[PDB]
Design a protein around this ligand. Structure first.
Ligand SMILES: NCc1ccc(S(N)(=O)=O)cc1
Length: 458
């Protein structure tokens, strides 16, 4: 009874379809009403509601909010929420049934915020200055525990900001023609295919484990705030592009037909080791390379593959068909560790982003579509389940450095570079029915694969 005037406290404007929308269905009957959308004011209100706790909304909100609210603005709204004015009189119930419950719900939000999304503060020291200054100003007797708990989390995050443990013997590193410390001799064909697969899998596992759901929500990696909203996603996308184009480049620049067949075969071996390692990211990067317009059209090179190499490629390619029907089946059947195919989460998020309005309307004046953010958090959520299981393989630092530095494009555009691959493809297997032209090798190394049975393994 008796809140302050909406005129001095924007959160207590009356609930109407002007400001807030709930799901009206059989699920929303029992218990905590389910939010479909509202003004950001109204969503903040319900994020810190006096009448009940809402752990599920707090989790979804803090995962998704960056698609509709800046971190600086969220802090401003939680402080605005916190600074609750006195009701209009002619306080004791107001203070214990409204204020204290609301202020604890705010401090609970801050606690989830610094616990699970401290990257927001790592990305913006000013954001953290504002949070530290505000939290240190809270002198409420019952607030004390919460304030201490938030301080302890910030201390732990700052520590680990400044400050690999094998649970079983990892396999011995495999060497082919390229020997350790000879990084200048590192090529697709001089490195061991087993170790190429292992070190790309370690690189790709590391890139994949660093991606936060929030880097995907509201397709933020394509918007202009992407380098800050999606740094880990964009490293992973740039990796995929560089490795996919490196495989294409290795195939199409092998002018000598025998060499090119040996190169395509070696790639397919690498694909088999990716499959053994449940690195489906790796599998579908190679699939991506071999269905590329510049490599797809090399009918003579494909034809000359051993039927067994052909078979492994066909099975891999089929994982991708019918909207990755078989990949999705395979992914649910394997034992981690694994690197999921990252592309399909991007695709399925673009479809969900594109297909749902960011807003319910402009008649209520920016009613945020929250249910849209819930559906995307279900997709980003699936990412999480394979991020907590590391590979029992050893880093080969110079191989790691080679693969981290892959730059097939050089200074050219993606476009300039894919035009080049295509002009090269037409040169090496022209659009005529004559046998493929016969070019000399420029490389001297044996074409012979050591295969994908471990050698030093034993
Ligand atoms: N050059 C014919 C050709 C290219 C590539 C494939 S695939 N999709 O990689 O199995 C199949 C045939």
């Amino acid at each position: 009874l008796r809140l302050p005037s909406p005129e001095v406290y924007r959160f207590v404007v009356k609930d109407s379809e002007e400001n807030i929308v709930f799901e009206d269905n059989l699920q929303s009957r029992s218990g905590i009403p389910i939010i479909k959308g509202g003004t950001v004011v109204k969503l903040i209100e319900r994020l810190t509601y006096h009448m009940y706790a809402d752990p599920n909304f707090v989790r979804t909100f803090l995962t998704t909010y960056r698609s509709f609210c800046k971190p600086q603005e969220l802090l401003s709204l939680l402080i605005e929420r916190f600074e609750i004015p006195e009701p209009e009189p002619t306080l004791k119930r107001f203070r214990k049934e409204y204020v204290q419950p609301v202020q604890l719900r705010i401090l609970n939000v801050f606690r989830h915020w610094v616990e699970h999304h401290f990257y927001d503060f790592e990305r913006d020291l000013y954001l953290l200055e504002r949070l530290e200054s505000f939290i240190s100003s809270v002198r409420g007797k019952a607030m004390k525990k919460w304030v201490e708990s938030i301080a302890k989390i910030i201390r732990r995050k700052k520590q680990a900001q400044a400050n690999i443990t094998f649970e079983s013997p990892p396999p011995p590193i495999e060497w082919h023609i390229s020997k350790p410390g000879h990084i200048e001799t590192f090529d697709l064909m001089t490195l061991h295919p087993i170790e190429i697969a292992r070190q790309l899998t370690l690189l790709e596992s590391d890139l994949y484990r660093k991606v936060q759901p929030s880097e995907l929500v509201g397709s933020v990696w394509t918007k202009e705030d992407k380098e800050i909203n999606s740094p880990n996603l964009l490293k992973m996308i740039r990796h995929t592009t560089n490795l996919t184009l490196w495989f294409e480049k290795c195939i199409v620049e092998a002018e000598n037909f025998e060499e090119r067949v040996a190169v395509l075969s070696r790639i397919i071996e690498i694909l088999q080791v990716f499959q053994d390692l449940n690195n489906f990211n790796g599998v579908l990067e190679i699939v991506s390379a071999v269905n590329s317009v510049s490599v797809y059209r090399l009918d003579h090179t494909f034809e000359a593959l051993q039927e067994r190499k052909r078979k492994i490629l066909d099975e891999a390619v089929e994982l991708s068909q019918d909207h990755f029907k078989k990949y999705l089946v395979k992914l649910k059947s394997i034992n981690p560790p694994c690197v999921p195919f990252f592309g399909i989460y991007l695709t399925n998020i673009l479809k969900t982003e594109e297909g749902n309005n960011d807003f319910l309307t402009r008649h209520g004046k920016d009613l945020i579509n929250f249910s849209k953010r819930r559906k995307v958090a279900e997709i980003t959520g699936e990412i999480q389940q394979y991020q907590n299981q590391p590979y029992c393989l050893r880093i080969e630092p110079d191989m790691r450095r080679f693969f981290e530095n892959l730059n097939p494009m050089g200074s050219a555009s993606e476009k300039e570079f894919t035009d080049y691959l295509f002009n090269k493809s037409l040169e090496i297997e022209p659009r005529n029915p004559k046998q493929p032209p016969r070019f000399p090798r420029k490389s001297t190394f044996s074409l012979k694969s050591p295969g994908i049975r471990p050698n030093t393994g034993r």
